[PDB]
């Protein structure tokens, strides 16, 4: 298609599912982020 063909990375999934779309590894990583943020890590990606 003769258009500019690029897209907008400005958007994404805000409100995660009730586990319905997530693998065991993704359900685990959600569990990690919750306890990690409770541990005062400030919503960073740094798991240690």
């Amino acid at each position: 298609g003769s258009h500019m063909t690029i897209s907008q990375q400005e958007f994404g999934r805000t409100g995660l599912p009730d586990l319905s779309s997530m693998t065991e590894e993704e359900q685990i990583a959600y569990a990690m982020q919750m306890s990690l943020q409770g541990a005062e890590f400030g919503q960073a990606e740094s798991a240690d």
Binding site: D18, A31, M34, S35, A39
Partner: protein, 95 residues
């Protein structure tokens, strides 16, 4: 030691567990409190500070606090005992 618990459904509870014992004993108390239908030892997993707790390792090794929360999850099933309208037992009022 009264560890606060949190679920993947974002529900929250507490577990008075012995910190003298291992993470397997935390799992034992969770199965004891919530029942095998909700959280069996063999199906639940335990996560603190973004890291999965080793079942054979002690609770002190992760310095778990009472006011902070641990995360518990259960694999494959997701069903729970939802409530219903208890008012059905009378369904009338004094007004």
């Amino acid at each position: 030691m009264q560890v606060t618990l949190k679920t993947l459904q974002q529900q929250t509870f507490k577990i008075d567990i012995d910190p003298e014992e291992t993470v397997k004993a935390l799992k034992e108390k969770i199965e004891s409190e919530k029942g095998k239908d909700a959280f069996p030892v063999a199906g639940q997993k335990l996560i603190y500070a973004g890291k999965i707790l080793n079942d054979d390792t002690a609770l002190k090794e992760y310095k778990i606090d009472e006011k902070n929360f641990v995360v518990v999850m259960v694999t494959k099933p997701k069903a729970v005992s939802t409530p219903a309208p208890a008012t059905l037992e009378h369904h009338h009022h004094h007004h």
